[PDB]
């Protein structure tokens, strides 16, 4: 299975305001992966953000960005996304999606270890 994550968006955003990041998948069946983002803040451990299942209604999403993000794909386009609002500084951070064949994965999956298939990276940077 021939895989790629190309991420889009990010950027720089007002404190308050809101992004959308894209991680665009290629390869054979979308559906098949656990596909999650991770944001890695300077000096800080890598932390898990929002995750979900191929073809999963419930997704994981952290303490610290829940009621403020959200997450889901777009199966005609084969890319997930994840919804950023009422943005803080401490969401600054490089943000990251990645993907994992759900034949033996666990759920929910909040390890980044586990992960077998990695986006670029995208820097956002909240300005106050």
């Known amino acids: 299975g021939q895989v790629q994550l190309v991420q889009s968006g990010g950027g720089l955003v007002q404190a308050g305001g809101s992004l959308r990041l894209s991680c665009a998948f290629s390869?054979?069946?979308?559906?098949?992966?656990?596909m999650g983002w991770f944001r890695q803040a300077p000096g800080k451990e890598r932390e898990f953000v929002a995750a979900?299942?191929?073809?999963?209604?419930?997704?994981d999403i952290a303490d610290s960005v829940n009621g403020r993000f959200t997450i889901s794909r777009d199966n005609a386009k084969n890319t997930l996304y994840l919804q950023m609002d009422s943005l803080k500084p401490e969401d600054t951070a490089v943000y990251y999606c990645?993907?994992?064949?759900?034949?033996?994965?666990?759920?929910?999956?909040?390890?980044?270890?586990?992960?077998?298939?990695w986006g670029q990276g995208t820097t956002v940077t909240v300005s106050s």
């Open positions: 990645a993907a994992d064949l759900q034949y033996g994965s666990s759920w929910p999956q909040r390890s980044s270890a586990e992960y077998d298939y």
């Open positions: 390869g054979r069946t979308f559906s098949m992966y656990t």
């Open positions: 979900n299942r191929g073809r999963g209604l419930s997704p």
